[PDB]
Design a protein around this ligand. Structure first.
Ligand code: NA
Ligand code: NA
Ligand code: NA
Ligand code: NA
Ligand code: NA
Ligand code: NA
Ligand code: NA
Ligand code: NA
Lengths: 150, 146
């Protein structure tokens, strides 16, 4: 049957790449902590703003900038801010490259999407990619948000 | 803030101003924060509390009704009537809707502890529940049908 869940691998970045990149600044943060009965997340994607509620079912409301900045401070300590660059490798695989801000600096991650779950296994990373972290729990989004400075 | 609250034995006559109210909790009391939605007549709010910081944003009706379903089981819906007793004390009288029917509560505000302690309820008031934890707002919200 057709693709249900995307197939991807994620790496550190040894060298920021050259080439055509499209930049989007991103700020996202959790109002809740993982033991809460629900997950409530705020995100800014460019110039649009959302609050998401999940219970384990998913609600998303678009909010304006003033609603977002009034509530943002209640995400302190559980946030990820980064600029995301979208690009394409020479063979055509699309990538997203995150350059993290605040205490997660100097982290940079690159995530690659594959059309076949065997092109994924055949992938040869280009030299600018660092070590693979696909399986490392610490580099998942929520782990990154919940980590702490110092 | 100086107040006593009672059941209501008889709905009163006289000048009453009615406000429909709907208010519900997205969170459960063990959560790290409390997030409440409320509709107060024609304006709508989401409140976030964490014991302290408090945040309130005004939302529109569409945001409110999109999120309202995630308050199910933790809501109070009621019509609130504002009036004044013959001696001038202001009262708020709540007529509860859904499963909290047929509950009705009346709360009175006083300018002194002495006036509060001297208060003689009028005959339309029922038994006092100022101290009953069961009749507190969040307790009412968290109680369930049946
Ligand atoms: Na954090
Ligand atoms: Na190709
Ligand atoms: Na750092
Ligand atoms: Na490399
Ligand atoms: Na309830
Ligand atoms: Na008087
Ligand atoms: Na009932
Ligand atoms: Na009575």
């Amino acid at each position: 049957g057709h693709m249900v869940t995307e197939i991807e691998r994620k790496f550190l970045v040894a060298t920021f790449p050259d080439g055509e990149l499209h930049a989007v600044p991103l700020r996202q943060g959790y109002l809740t902590t993982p033991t809460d009965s629900i997950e409530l997340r705020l995100r800014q994607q460019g110039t649009e703003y959302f609050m998401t509620l999940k219970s384990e079912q998913e609600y998303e409301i678009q909010i304006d900038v003033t609603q977002f900045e009034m509530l943002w401070p209640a995400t302190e300590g559980r946030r990820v801010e980064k600029t995301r660059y979208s690009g394409k490798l020479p063979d055509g695989q699309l990538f997203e490259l995150d350059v993290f801000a605040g205490h997660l600096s100097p982290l940079m991650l690159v995530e690659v999407e594959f059309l076949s779950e065997d092109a994924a296994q055949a992938f040869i990373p280009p030299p600018w990619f660092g070590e693979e972290v696909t399986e490392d729990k610490r580099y998942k989004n929520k782990a990154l948000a919940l980590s702490i400075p110092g």
